[PDB]
């Protein structure tokens, strides 16, 4: 119809192919980034589990981009793979050239342009992956963004991608407090994943989590991926288990 090429537009004056790719992101699980002035928590959901699934020796919805920017993953992992690798390469290409770590804003911009190119040119598929980017660069402090499949970006103070977006967003903005705390944000995340996800228990092995903090020294940022057994201790504290 007007799915038939990616380089043709519908008489409505939308593009069905892109819209369709946007629906691709609602067959994968929730990912939540909340920015606080005292840190960013990055949270991700594992949409597949089994009792023989090894998932306790692996990170796969948390990928470090350089030493100061990391992303959370929602969507197809095959789609994700190619763009994460490219992003890591460009961000650190900036490091070589300019002898400073890449600003958060430029690297998202670079990557959103490449997405638009796959729709604009050739007969390639658009990519149905929504990444929440969390970084630190001196020129605007903590910085949070997230990217659409279309190939554009918007800033946020909190955002949710993945499945059941509409509900999840509702829940976040009800319970947000403008100053926030890094600890209160983690707690908020878990509260939200618990409700959108049908895994009622919401166990450690179903959660990936990363916190970006400047608490390690000053002027120096430490990105710490939470490891499984640690994820289990903070569910007791919030009472979920």
């Amino acid at each position: 119809r007007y799915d038939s090429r990616t380089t043709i537009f519908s008489p409505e004056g939308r593009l069905y192919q892109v819209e369709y790719a946007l629906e691709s992101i609602s067959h994968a699980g929730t990912a939540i980034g909340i920015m606080a002035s005292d840190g960013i928590v990055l949270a991700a959901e594992r949409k597949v589990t089994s009792t023989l699934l090894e998932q306790d020796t692996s990170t796969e919805k948390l990928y470090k981009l350089n030493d100061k920017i990391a992303v959370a993953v929602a969507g197809l992992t095959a789609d994700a793979e190619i763009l994460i690798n490219t992003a890591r390469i460009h961000a650190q290409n900036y490091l070589k050239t300019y002898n400073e770590d890449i600003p958060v804003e430029i690297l998202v911009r670079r990557l959103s342009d490449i997405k638009q190119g796959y729709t604009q040119h050739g007969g390639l598929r658009p990519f149905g992956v929504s990444f929440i980017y969390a970084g630190y660069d001196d020129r605007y402090g903590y910085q949070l963004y997230t990217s659409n499949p279309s190939g554009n970006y918007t800033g946020w103070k909190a955002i949710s991608v993945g499945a059941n977006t509409s509900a999840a967003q509702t829940l976040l903005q009800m319970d947000y407090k403008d100053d926030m705390k890094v600890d209160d944000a983690i707690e908020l995340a878990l509260k939200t994943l618990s409700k959108t996800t049908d895994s009622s228990a919401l166990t450690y092995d179903r959660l990936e989590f990363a916190t970006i903090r400047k608490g390690a020294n000053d002027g120096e940022v430490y990105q710490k991926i939470f490891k499984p057994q640690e994820i289990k201790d903070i569910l007791v504290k919030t009472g979920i288990t």
């Binding site: 380089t7 043709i8 537009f9 008489p11 997405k115 040119h121 050739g122 800033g155």
Partner: protein, 252 residues
């Protein structure tokens, strides 16, 4: 078919992909441009949806192309990004080649050229993005405001509305604004851009963004307070209007 590609001329001499690109513009935000005699105001509607959206780190709908040429855009933001980057790179290149700053005319003709090229081929669709390019000439004062379309046609217009429900703004802009005598002051100019946008927002001074370009490489983007002060002055003169009708009715 016959709308299935750009390489189909169609049995009516219309390129459907150019037509559908046009329809695309409407979905983006409203934008209005108004020239004075010592300014251009380049104004845009600023979208809101949530108060968890930043405005701190997030692009505006206005982007400085160089330092004396500016651009506002309407359409898909995703599409527009690539448009804006190319427009900028060329504007810097212009001084690589000649050692002059860019002309306003040179630039708009180029950005339509880039889409026209895309339109011409069949492999690639053109962008669904219309821009207003505002600026002043290299050494001179003479305000310049220009329009581009996805077809790759460019024009000059004294004043112009593009984006969501362009026509309904347009008619109002037409009536109040004149070709014969454009706004005296930069101040008066800005408020006219505010009247136009007021309509399309509903309520707001927080979903209205104002920027000014003036000659001599002067670009300033006006603070939010000053926009709030102006939406309130427009409501104050508007109240004077309601009453003035009541008085006129009593007299006669």
């Amino acid at each position: 078919g016959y709308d299935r590609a750009l390489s189909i001329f169609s049995p009516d001499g219309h390129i459907f992909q150019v037509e559908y690109a046009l329809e695309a513009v409407k979905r983006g935000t409203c934008a209005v441009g108004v020239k004075g005699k010592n300014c251009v105001v380049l104004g845009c509607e600023r979208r809101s949806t949530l108060k968890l959206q930043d405005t701190r780190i997030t692009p505006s709908k206005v982007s400085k192309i160089d330092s004396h040429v500016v651009l506002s855009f309407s359409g898909l933001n995703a599409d527009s990004r690539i448009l804006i980057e190319k427009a900028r790179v060329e504007a810097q290149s212009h001084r690589l080649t000649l050692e002059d700053p860019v002309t306003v005319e040179y630039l708009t003709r180029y950005v339509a050229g880039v889409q026209q090229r895309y339109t011409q081929s069949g492999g690639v669709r053109p962008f669904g993005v219309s821009t207003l390019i505002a600026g002043f000439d290299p050494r001179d004062d003479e305000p310049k405001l220009y329009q581009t379309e996805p077809s790759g046609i460019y024009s000059s217009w004294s004043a112009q509305t593009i984006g969501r429900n362009s026509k309904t703004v347009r008619e109002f802009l037409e009536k109040n604004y004149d070709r014969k005598e454009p706004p005296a002051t930069v101040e008066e100019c800005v408020k006219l851009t505010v009247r136009s946008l007021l309509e399309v927002v509903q309520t707001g001074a927080k979903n209205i963004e104002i920027t000014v370009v003036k000659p001599d490489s002067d670009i300033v983007a006006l603070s939010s307070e000053e926009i709030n002060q102006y939406v309130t002055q427009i409501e104050q003169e508007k109240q004077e209007q309601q009453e003035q009708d009541k008085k006129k009715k009593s007299n006669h």
